[PDB]
């Protein structure tokens, strides 16, 4: 089983540097190459460069030569990519992948790694402010989770007893913080008669909040 385990999500400040890890297992590390691909959330892939661990020889995309540096440690079967002078444009998911090799590098990648999410920001760990959202047969309620950093948060409704008719929207960046929203739809008889509560947790700040949706 080919496997490329990538380090945890990196959080760096602008102008700082980061070094991503890519530990390989399930095959002979020195028999293949390791490329790195950039993927900004919601769009295509971008090739960064290549390294051949057995010899250390590396190829680069001209766009990343000064910013990225590819190394590898055959003793630990780990590939590294160091980024310098980080900017908001560098925030993305970074994959490592194993490259096919024969009589020469083939430059297509048959095994991809976990994926490391890099966030370039100066924000500090901030807990969310959870705000209820209140206004026929159905009733739609909401839960506004605003001003937290970093990702992620978890959201449930009545401790999970409300699972159908629920969907949470992706977080957006608002004032260098994250803002999220969750929607729950229940029959109009259950509420306002029977309480509806949104359970929000922000593991990074070690905060839990339960906000009851009150009618106006």
């Amino acid at each position: 089983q080919v496997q490329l385990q990538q380090s945890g999500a990196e959080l760096a400040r602008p102008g700082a540097s980061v070094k991503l890890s890519c530990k390989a297992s399930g095959y002979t590390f020195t028999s293949y190459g390791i490329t790195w691909v950039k993927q900004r959330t919601g769009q295509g892939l971008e090739w960064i460069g290549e390294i051949y661990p057995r010899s250390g020889k590396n190829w680069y995309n001209e766009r990343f030569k000064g910013k990225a540096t590819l190394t590898a440690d055959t003793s630990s079967s780990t590939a590294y990519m160091e980024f310098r002078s980080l900017t908001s444009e560098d925030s993305a998911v970074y994959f490592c992948a194993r490259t096919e090799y024969g009589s020469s590098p083939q430059w297509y990648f048959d095994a991809w790694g976990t994926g490391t999410t890099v966030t370039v920001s100066s924000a500090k760990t901030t807990p969310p402010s959870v705000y209820p959202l209140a206004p026929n047969s159905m009733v739609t309620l909401g839960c506004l989770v605003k001003g937290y950093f970093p990702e992620p948060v978890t959201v449930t409704w009545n401790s999970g007893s409300l699972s159908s008719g629920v969907h949470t929207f992706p977080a957006v960046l608002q004032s260098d913080l994250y803002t999220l929203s969750s929607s729950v739809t229940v029959p109009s008889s259950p509420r306002p008669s029977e309480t509806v509560t949104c359970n929000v947790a922000h593991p990074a700040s070690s905060t839990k909040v339960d906000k009851k949706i009150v009618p106006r």
Partner: protein
């Protein structure tokens, strides 16, 4: 930097449909084109390499062909487990470049968005801020526009939007638009409105509330 023009970018499909994805290169290649599958929140998986060759484990319904400038990737009969984004890639010369991608979705009957507007909560107003939230839930197709109006005056700045992916159950889409003001300006106006423009209706779906 060779350009791989991949079409279509978005493709609705029904189970057992024949999917055909095209990928045109900006210059003449031999056959160094590979194809990848990426499911939401997952890593890409190689499917085809050198235009025609399947990778280990790939089912037979996935095929690829082409040479020179035109390359095609076909699914004989799409399955539910095949719903994902598909990329072509050229492994001919450096820098190696991928296509724009092709996202599949489950075809579905049209559905109008259930619109719901929520005024700022009492809790939030204790912080000098006010967020008006608008939900546009369970509509198809995905294409939709949301417009805000304060006392009938269109509002642009301060509006952040967010879209869900296609729901696994009802195969619908949902959106949330959030107008965020200061408590000061929020109290300078009376009515607040979000208008949803969707192909299911020639006139927008309007929801409003009065701060008083």
């Amino acid at each position: 930097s060779i350009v791989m023009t991949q079409t279509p970018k978005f493709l609705p499909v029904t189970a057992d449909d024949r999917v055909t994805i095209t990928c045109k290169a900006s210059q003449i290649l031999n056959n160094e084109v590979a194809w990848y599958q990426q499911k939401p929140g997952q890593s890409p998986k190689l499917l085809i390499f050198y235009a025609s060759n399947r990778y280990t484990g790939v089912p037979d319904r996935f095929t690829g062909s082409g040479s020179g400038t035109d390359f095609t990737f076909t699914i004989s009969s799409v399955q539910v487990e095949d719903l994902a984004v598909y990329f072509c890639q050229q492994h001919y010369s450096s820098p190696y470049t991928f296509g724009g991608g092709t996202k599949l979705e489950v075809k579905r009957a049209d559905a109008a968005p259930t619109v719901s507007i929520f005024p700022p909560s009492s809790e939030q107003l204790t912080s000098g801020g006010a967020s008006v939230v608008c939900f546009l839930n369970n509509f198809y197709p995905k294409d939709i526009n949301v417009k805000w109006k304060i006392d009938g005056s269109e509002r642009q700045n301060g509006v952040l939007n967010s879209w869900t992916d296609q729901d696994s159950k009802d195969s619908t889409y949902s959106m949330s638009s959030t107008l965020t003001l200061t408590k000061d300006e929020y109290e300078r106006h009376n009515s607040y409105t979000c208008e949803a423009t969707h192909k299911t209706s020639t006139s927008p779906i309007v929801k409003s509330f009065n701060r008083n």
